[PDB]
Amino acid sequence: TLVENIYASVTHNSKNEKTKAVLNQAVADLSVAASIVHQVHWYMRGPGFLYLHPKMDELLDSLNANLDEVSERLITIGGAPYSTLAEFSKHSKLDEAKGTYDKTVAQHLARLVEVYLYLSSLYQVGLDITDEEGDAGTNDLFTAAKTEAEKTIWMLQAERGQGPAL
Amino acid sequence: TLVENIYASVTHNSKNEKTKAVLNQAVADLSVAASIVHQVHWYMRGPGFLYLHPKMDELLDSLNANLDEVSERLITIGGAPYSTLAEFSKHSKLDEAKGTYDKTVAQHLARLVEVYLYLSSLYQVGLDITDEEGDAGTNDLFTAAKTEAEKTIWMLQAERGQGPAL
Amino acid sequence: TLVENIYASVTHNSKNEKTKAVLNQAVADLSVAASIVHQVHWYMRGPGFLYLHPKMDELLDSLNANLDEVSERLITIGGAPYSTLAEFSKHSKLDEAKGTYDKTVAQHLARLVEVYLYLSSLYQVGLDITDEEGDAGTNDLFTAAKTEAEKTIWMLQAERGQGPAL
Amino acid sequence: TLVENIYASVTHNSKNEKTKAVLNQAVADLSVAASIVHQVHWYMRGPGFLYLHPKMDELLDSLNANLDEVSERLITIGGAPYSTLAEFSKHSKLDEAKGTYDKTVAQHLARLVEVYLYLSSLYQVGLDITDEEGDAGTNDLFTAAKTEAEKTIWMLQAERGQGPAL
Amino acid sequence: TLVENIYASVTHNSKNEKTKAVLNQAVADLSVAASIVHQVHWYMRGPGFLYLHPKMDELLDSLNANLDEVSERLITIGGAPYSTLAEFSKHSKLDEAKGTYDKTVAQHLARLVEVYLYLSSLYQVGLDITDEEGDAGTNDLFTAAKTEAEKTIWMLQAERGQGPAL
Amino acid sequence: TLVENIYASVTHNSKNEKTKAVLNQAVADLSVAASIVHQVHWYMRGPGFLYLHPKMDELLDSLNANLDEVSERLITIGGAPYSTLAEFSKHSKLDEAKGTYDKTVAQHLARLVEVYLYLSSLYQVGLDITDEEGDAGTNDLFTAAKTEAEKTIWMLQAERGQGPAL
Amino acid sequence: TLVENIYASVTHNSKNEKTKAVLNQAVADLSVAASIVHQVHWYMRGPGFLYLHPKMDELLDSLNANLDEVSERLITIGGAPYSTLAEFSKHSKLDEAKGTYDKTVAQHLARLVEVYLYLSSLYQVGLDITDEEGDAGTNDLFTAAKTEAEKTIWMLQAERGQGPAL
Amino acid sequence: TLVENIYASVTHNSKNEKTKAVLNQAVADLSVAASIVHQVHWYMRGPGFLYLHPKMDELLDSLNANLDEVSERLITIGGAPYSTLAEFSKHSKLDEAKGTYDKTVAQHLARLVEVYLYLSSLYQVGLDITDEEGDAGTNDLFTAAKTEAEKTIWMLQAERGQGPAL
Amino acid sequence: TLVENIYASVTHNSKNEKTKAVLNQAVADLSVAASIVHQVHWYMRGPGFLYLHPKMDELLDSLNANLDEVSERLITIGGAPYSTLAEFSKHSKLDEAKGTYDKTVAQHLARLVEVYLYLSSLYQVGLDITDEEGDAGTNDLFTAAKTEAEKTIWMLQAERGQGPAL
Amino acid sequence: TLVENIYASVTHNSKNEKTKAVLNQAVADLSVAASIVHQVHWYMRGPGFLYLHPKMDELLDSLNANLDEVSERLITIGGAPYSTLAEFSKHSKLDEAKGTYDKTVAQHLARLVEVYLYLSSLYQVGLDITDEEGDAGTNDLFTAAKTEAEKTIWMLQAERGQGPAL
Amino acid sequence: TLVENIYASVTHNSKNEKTKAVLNQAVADLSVAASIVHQVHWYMRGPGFLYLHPKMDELLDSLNANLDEVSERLITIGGAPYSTLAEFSKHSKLDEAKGTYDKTVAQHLARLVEVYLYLSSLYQVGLDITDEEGDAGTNDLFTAAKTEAEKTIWMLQAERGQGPAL
Amino acid sequence: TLVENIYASVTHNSKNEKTKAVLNQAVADLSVAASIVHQVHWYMRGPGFLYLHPKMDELLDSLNANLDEVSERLITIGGAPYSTLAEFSKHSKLDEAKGTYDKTVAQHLARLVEVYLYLSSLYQVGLDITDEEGDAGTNDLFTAAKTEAEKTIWMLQAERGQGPAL
Ligand SMILES: [Cl-]
Ligand SMILES: [Cl-]
Ligand SMILES: [Cl-]
Ligand SMILES: [Cl-]
Ligand SMILES: [Cl-]
Ligand SMILES: [Cl-]
Ligand SMILES: [Cl-]
Ligand SMILES: [Cl-]
Ligand SMILES: [Cl-]
Ligand SMILES: [Cl-]
Ligand SMILES: [Cl-]
Ligand SMILES: [Cl-]
Ligand SMILES: [Zn+2]
Ligand SMILES: [Zn+2]
Ligand SMILES: [Zn+2]
Ligand SMILES: [Zn+2]
Ligand SMILES: [Zn+2]
Ligand SMILES: [Zn+2]
Ligand SMILES: [Zn+2]
Ligand SMILES: [Zn+2]
Ligand SMILES: [Zn+2]
Ligand SMILES: [Zn+2]
Ligand SMILES: [Zn+2]
Ligand SMILES: [Zn+2]
Ligand SMILES: [Zn+2]
Ligand SMILES: [Zn+2]
Ligand SMILES: [Zn+2]
Ligand SMILES: [Zn+2]
Ligand SMILES: [Zn+2]
Ligand SMILES: [Zn+2]
Ligand SMILES: [Zn+2]
Ligand SMILES: [Zn+2]
Ligand SMILES: [Zn+2]
Ligand SMILES: [Zn+2]
Ligand SMILES: [Zn+2]
Ligand SMILES: [Zn+2]
Ligand SMILES: [Zn+2]
Ligand SMILES: [Zn+2]
Ligand SMILES: [Zn+2]
Ligand SMILES: [Zn+2]
Ligand SMILES: [Zn+2]
Ligand SMILES: [Zn+2]
Ligand SMILES: [Zn+2]
Ligand SMILES: [Zn+2]
Ligand SMILES: [Zn+2]
Ligand SMILES: [Zn+2]
Ligand SMILES: [Zn+2]
Ligand SMILES: [Zn+2]
């Protein structure tokens, strides 16, 4: 599963080391996810743009709220968040591609769903790790982020005419 | 001057090509500037943290508003904004360093001042280019961004006990 | 007509008996209409979900405001509103079907239009009855509810690419 | 205990089947609870009506917020919520009776307390099931709903001159 | 009936003379009703004071909104509203008594119910008269005031443990 | 009377044809009335300008709210509103004159009063027609618009030192 | 002086008897003042109506706030406020006259100034009495009411082209 | 009197020494009063709880606003406020008892009235002392606090069915 | 180009004559543009209506804000704005057609894009003229209006699946 | 012209020296203008006072916002604003006279118009100077201030019954 | 003392002459104090600028609210406030110095404390004078201004690491 | 560890006895913590006071929100919260000292950090106990309080120039 792979990857490289590592992974991934969402906001063309475009700023605002919270939680528990674009891009497991206006609305929606599926799996790894290390506060952070990610998947999937398939 | 160098660099690589290039340069630089500001928000330690920390989120909100406006202006006039972290980091003329908690408040303030001085010079290049190409709307965008950057320099300089020296 | 049939049905089973009966019919029908609208809110899949889904909560809020007003009006004039789910379901003239994700957006819109057409006809019966019995206050309630129902039909019909055909 | 009986009943009829079943049970029960609360709102007579009546709309608003959240959570995790009045009434473990103006304020308060005691027990079953199946997000939903139900029991009990006895 | 008596009295002493007379009667009666409500606000003693006291200011605000609207409507249609305390007190059909702290909460509630019953009957006379004279705008004013008066009767009656008996 | 003439004119050129015609007449007249009000807003000179000028924007906002409501009501009941400036100007019974700064404040006030007197008479025709055709919803629309027009006449007349003379 | 006469009159008919008497005098006078202000609100005709009319509702709101505060203060200190229109009209030292549309704006302004001059003198008597009886709380109430009355005199006088002459 | 005893006690142990002592006495007493009010908020059982419980938080918010103001005033005039729970409890003249759920609503109301009667007497001592020492600013603070305390006594007494008896 | 033609047309028929002429041209064109937008608001049918319909009121509000600003600017600089529907319709370079429900959503979007392209070209003429005549304030007005028009073109084009092509 | 004289005067006594001088001139003049406006606010007597008086506080608020912006802009670009009353009064080109209550409303309006005409001419000098020295940000500041000054002239002139004559 | 000297000075040059003189002294001093505060706002450099700078605008807003209130009180009681910068500067007992960026934060804080100490002493003189002349309303104005000045001294002193020493 | 000691102490003296004991311990400790925070609010002197002082009221508001929630949770689950100052002071594990103005800002910050470290350890004990006893609702309460305490430690530590060291 992606969850096993994320776990393996996060814990490859102190009592809360794995929690710090998974939080930092989320710093990088939230930063890349925000960049991807912004790309949709800007490059989208097609019917529905007029409600999808502002929807991207709502998703963006939430991703950025997640980022600040995750990173401040990481600092709070004695870690050191990635804090440069090169660190985000190297450590994130999300890929980016050059923006192009010729992607269809359907392609943007599928990409967003993949981003949120990835984030929900990362957060599940965050749940497992924080349970193992006994960090209830960070577990609650990951629980809320996963729950919101899953709801977002359901809604984007619905917009695509599909079930949540999460 | 930095202004001459930015101009040379922007126009090194259609009736509004240079305006599009300078806007895109601003996309990259605003993105890196936001990242730098976030790093201060997170890594700062020292007396004054309790008002400087939320001040960074205000600066961040403004930089991100600038970014969206600049990028949508670029799209509007027929360009294609950078829209990945790797593009921001490669094309930006701002450098980033790994976050460290041992930077002093004075070092963070000096870094912010350098970022805003850089942005104000970039915007001056934007003014020259948009005047040359007759893009009044983009000229107004750069005028407001420069004016706000300059005010920010004055205030950060004041916090450092210095004059604006812009 | 549906109006004749609703009238016949309402008045089949005191100076304001028919007004009380038509108000109570509206209690049952508003309750079922709200349930139907909620089903669309939940089960819808397809392009447009992202504005249609919150639109259902707006329609729902209005139906529930109608319900409380109608029921309190009924109480106020000396009646006794239905106040259990089994009473709503037995006395309502609206049918419900088990939710299914495979209904198309077009089917949900057609169903909503039928619900509002039904409600507007019920309210017309409410107008006739309250005029006959001289209840100006309840007549005004039905007038506003009918007017809002008719506007809703026009807008939902427009979303379907059709005229109001009311 | 009621908790054992609810569990037995929910799980009588895939990795998250029991979580889906308990969420759907909550759909039905929240719907019936809202109906019961509305009946108090409408039929109550006696000293205190003027603050108890609007209190019922507050309880109602919260029950309806719970309903939408529970049902959207159910959809999100791959289930299918009850979405007709006949399904709510058949599957709910709460009974309803015909409204009557001759119930005393004390009887309405006792009924509300029983409804919330039932809901808190249902949510405890939701906690057990979501812990067993590893659904942290749904566990958090049930935790918050139980906590709010318990607080509501304490306050309604206090209004009756009694301790929470939960 | 009180309605017949109010009508007789109003029309005892131009195309809209009776509408003007009934509006002016409402000026006087709303003014006295407000005074009565204020007396309850001030003189009430007993359990429930803490929600009944502010409830009187809500009733008062509505009565005063009614007064201004009625009086401006009267002016608008070519009449001349009573506009002194002696005119209100002489022409009103409501009686006042000296305030006393020894009235019970039950007595205040009964008095308020009588005031609103009187006002609803006056408004019914306003409905009959405005229908007869073809003043739709003033008819709508009386319809809304009657509907609000009737709702108020239902709620005050409920607080007394009684049905609306309107 | 003007009312007879408006009626004759509206019904000169289906169960609700006259209601549709009178609504469409209101579309044209509201559009011209708004234009006239705007002309006062712009061209007025004289003492009182500083409260009369913003008063024109309030009158304008209300006229435009009326216009949208009337036109959407017309659409809702199966008609087709005028929707070009040439249609408004040809079908409106209100005349316009070229703006001039030499009109006195008194002349602007007299003109506004004539506009509102005209609109109130048109709305009376709307009342008669909607009563005849049994359109309660449109009757309520015209009732509220007439009532507001009449109040506006009273206030503008008062500003002129005159009675409503409606 | 009017102050001597008010004092004589108030104290003509326990440790705080005079404070209670002066507060009750204010109950009656505030009630009559509000009635007078309302009469101006309704009957005024002439240039300036459009800002003077809403100004009367502001003055009215303040007078009614004064009334409630004065009367609740009276209750609080062990008195019994006038609470019927006949008591207000008999005990007030302000006279009322039948409303007439032929009063000029200048006459309304002069009347308001006389009302406020009277109230400020009454409040001065309230200051003297509360100082004599050692009621600091009621003294503060009268101080604020006098200060506001005096400011109102200055502004109304200014509108008349006159100095405060208080 | 209690006032004489408070004075004696306050001034038992510089130009404003007595003002500082009475302010500090208020620090201690406001702190204990807040604790007592909180105890009612938590331990109350009986009809009326649902409006009395939030009423305690309003009383609490005001007591805490008083506390901060009194203590900052004390600091401002050169004193040193009590600032530990042991100082509040030792120096306050209010007694506390262990919370118990078996106190009746009537007992809680009587206790609150005693607390406010005590506070109003303390504030009267504050008035006498600040007058004697010429501290107008602190006199105004005590005047407003006494006036609010007295109003609170009137309202709580009314809820008990009694007059203010202050 | 359209820009050359608008210029030629505006300046065909004092130090700021051309600025006044171009502002007045904008008065006429903004008025016709608003009418066209309203026609879309009313006549549109098809999927997307539910977000496109309110989008038209946003566009309308902005066009009307532009109109008032342009016209007040014209007055301010010594001109005389068109202020009748016949002047708007004769002098505007925008054509209108009778509303019809059979236009597709795509046709409405194309028409809006043409309107905004026209307005942006008119504003460019306004920029050239105000630069030539040295009217910086009016130049700023046209700059902001052009920038907003261009952004609107980009967004409407995106909704059509197209690039801005401005 | 006044513009030539202001220019001569400003530049009588570094790359942005003239921009700094004109900004500082505006510091002094805005300060004196605010003082003049305050004098009207206080000393005015005559019909219209009740809307003109609060209008002066609006003008005052804007002048003070201008002052802070101008002065902070001056600081930002490396200057040193006047910051004492004696500097404002010596360097301002506006004269003040002792307040007197015998100035007519017409005299106050004429004085305000002269103040704003002066300020608009000063801002024109600011435009010329900032264009010459290439300070786009300060040019934008002067453009907005001039545009607002000109609008204010138009409105005050209108209140006087005159055209803008700017 | 400064209080004796202010008194002597104020009363050196009718029943309320001294109250008018002390109010006018406050007009001049508040105006100079505002100017001084503005100078700190602009010229400050040093750590803490970022919270001290906006703190100056808060102090400024309060000083300007004081100024308007004092001056309107003076007008209200029959005086004539200073209303030119030259009058403020001549009659104020506060001195100003040319702004300079080389003042330290500590120097600005000490200066502000001296300004507020001066104002509190002036207000004490206002208290003595208004007590002597029996002007309770103006006494209350000075009491509130003194109390606020004293609190401000305490807080600024605290920022300096000092006690209030008032 | 402190956690072991708190646990030992809490459980030294029914299915949820330990949860009730730890909640009650939090009642006492939150009450003492609030008192300590208030002492800093009042007694602090030194640079930074102007942002640290209001920061204490924010911390205080949160501590008091925690207190009410904890205590109501305790009541809700069948316990009895401490509710007198003597109980808080005896049972709290936090010590208080007499306020003194000579504590440095650094000492206040260190004390606050110790308070929050203590509270976070107490909440960890609350987590362990609620997990052991199966109280998910109280576990969530302690999780949120711990998370907020930890964030507060990070920020206060940062203000001291230190890492969170939690
Ligand atoms: Cl890296
Ligand atoms: Cl690249
Ligand atoms: Cl049934
Ligand atoms: Cl079923
Ligand atoms: Cl009479
Ligand atoms: Cl036509
Ligand atoms: Cl009497
Ligand atoms: Cl002690
Ligand atoms: Cl023409
Ligand atoms: Cl000088
Ligand atoms: Cl002088
Ligand atoms: Cl104890
Ligand atoms: Zn956008
Ligand atoms: Zn955006
Ligand atoms: Zn790395
Ligand atoms: Zn933060
Ligand atoms: Zn942040
Ligand atoms: Zn690249
Ligand atoms: Zn939803
Ligand atoms: Zn929903
Ligand atoms: Zn049945
Ligand atoms: Zn209700
Ligand atoms: Zn309700
Ligand atoms: Zn079933
Ligand atoms: Zn009250
Ligand atoms: Zn009240
Ligand atoms: Zn009479
Ligand atoms: Zn305007
Ligand atoms: Zn306007
Ligand atoms: Zn036609
Ligand atoms: Zn009115
Ligand atoms: Zn009114
Ligand atoms: Zn009497
Ligand atoms: Zn509570
Ligand atoms: Zn509470
Ligand atoms: Zn002690
Ligand atoms: Zn619409
Ligand atoms: Zn619309
Ligand atoms: Zn023409
Ligand atoms: Zn004023
Ligand atoms: Zn003012
Ligand atoms: Zn100088
Ligand atoms: Zn600033
Ligand atoms: Zn500022
Ligand atoms: Zn002088
Ligand atoms: Zn404070
Ligand atoms: Zn505080
Ligand atoms: Zn104990």
Side-chain angles (χ1 to χ4, degrees), chain E residues 32 35 38-39 41-43 53 57 68 71-72 75 79-85 87-88 96-99 101, chain G residues 32 35 38-39 41-43 53 57 67-68 71-72 75 79-85 87-88 96-99 101:
Chain E
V32 173
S35 183
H38 234 174
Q39 183 175 80
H41 189 62
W42 293 332
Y43 278 90
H53 175 77
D57 271 351
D68 203 37
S71 170
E72 297 188 334
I75 300 158
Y82 299 125
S83 60
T84 74
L85 295 197
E87 292 180 303
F88 304 147
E96 299 192 270
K98 265 71 188 318
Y101 295 109
Chain G
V32 173
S35 183
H38 234 174
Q39 183 175 80
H41 189 62
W42 293 332
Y43 278 90
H53 175 77
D57 271 351
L67 172 57
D68 203 37
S71 170
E72 297 188 334
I75 300 158
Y82 299 125
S83 60
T84 74
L85 295 197
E87 292 180 303
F88 304 147
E96 299 192 270
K98 265 71 188 318
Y101 295 109

Side-chain angles (χ1 to χ4, degrees), chain H residues 32 35 38-39 41-43 53 57 68 71-72 75 79-85 87-88 96-99 101, chain L residues 32 35 38-39 41-43 53 57 67-68 71-72 75 79-85 87-88 96-99 101:
Chain H
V32 173
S35 183
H38 234 174
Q39 183 175 80
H41 189 62
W42 293 332
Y43 278 90
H53 175 77
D57 271 351
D68 203 37
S71 170
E72 297 188 334
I75 300 158
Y82 299 125
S83 60
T84 74
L85 295 197
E87 292 180 303
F88 304 147
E96 299 192 270
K98 265 71 188 318
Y101 295 109
Chain L
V32 173
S35 183
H38 234 174
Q39 183 175 80
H41 189 62
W42 293 332
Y43 278 90
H53 175 77
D57 271 351
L67 172 57
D68 203 37
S71 170
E72 297 188 334
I75 300 158
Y82 299 125
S83 60
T84 74
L85 295 197
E87 292 180 303
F88 304 147
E96 299 192 270
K98 265 71 188 318
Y101 295 109

Side-chain angles (χ1 to χ4, degrees), chain D residues 1-11 14 16-165:
Chain D
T1 58
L2 178 59
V3 166
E4 287 156 355
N5 295 312
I6 293 158
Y7 183 94
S9 164
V10 162
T11 59
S14 145
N16 68 348
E17 275 320 302
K18 294 181 181 173
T19 295
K20 293 188 294 184
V22 73
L23 283 169
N24 216 9
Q25 185 59 50
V27 175
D29 291 323
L30 282 163
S31 299
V32 173
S35 183
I36 293 170
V37 164
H38 234 174
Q39 183 175 80
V40 178
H41 189 62
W42 293 332
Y43 278 90
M44 177 178 279
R45 281 184 192 169
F49 174 85
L50 292 167
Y51 64 91
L52 291 168
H53 175 77
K55 172 75 175 174
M56 298 309 111
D57 271 351
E58 292 171 8
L59 293 181
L60 181 64
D61 288 350
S62 303
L63 290 173
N64 285 326
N66 291 147
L67 172 57
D68 203 37
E69 186 177 349
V70 157
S71 170
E72 297 188 334
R73 181 68 180 164
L74 178 55
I75 300 158
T76 294
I77 69 166
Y82 299 125
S83 60
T84 74
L85 295 197
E87 292 180 303
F88 304 147
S89 198
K90 180 186 183 211
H91 295 283
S92 177
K93 277 161 139 286
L94 289 166
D95 300 314
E96 299 192 270
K98 265 71 188 318
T100 167
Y101 295 109
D102 76 347
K103 295 272 171 77
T104 68
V105 161
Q107 286 183 284
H108 288 306
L109 294 171
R111 182 63 184 138
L112 295 168
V113 168
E114 293 186 328
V115 170
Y116 286 90
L117 279 164
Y118 170 81
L119 288 176
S120 73
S121 303
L122 168 63
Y123 300 151
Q124 176 61 51
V125 170
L127 298 178
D128 298 338
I129 284 176
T130 54
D131 272 334
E132 174 194 334
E133 295 184 333
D135 183 348
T138 305
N139 185 275
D140 276 20
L141 186 167
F142 284 125
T143 303
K146 191 179 163 60
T147 294
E148 170 191 59
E150 292 169 325
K151 184 168 191 191
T152 299
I153 291 162
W154 156 59
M155 299 179 80
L156 293 174
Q157 283 294 86
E159 180 68 21
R160 304 172 70 202
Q162 305 184 22

Side-chain angles (χ1 to χ4, degrees), chain J residues 48-66:
Chain J
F49 174 85
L50 292 167
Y51 64 91
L52 291 168
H53 175 77
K55 172 75 175 174
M56 298 309 111
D57 271 351
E58 292 171 8
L59 293 181
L60 181 64
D61 288 350
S62 303
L63 290 173
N64 285 326
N66 291 147

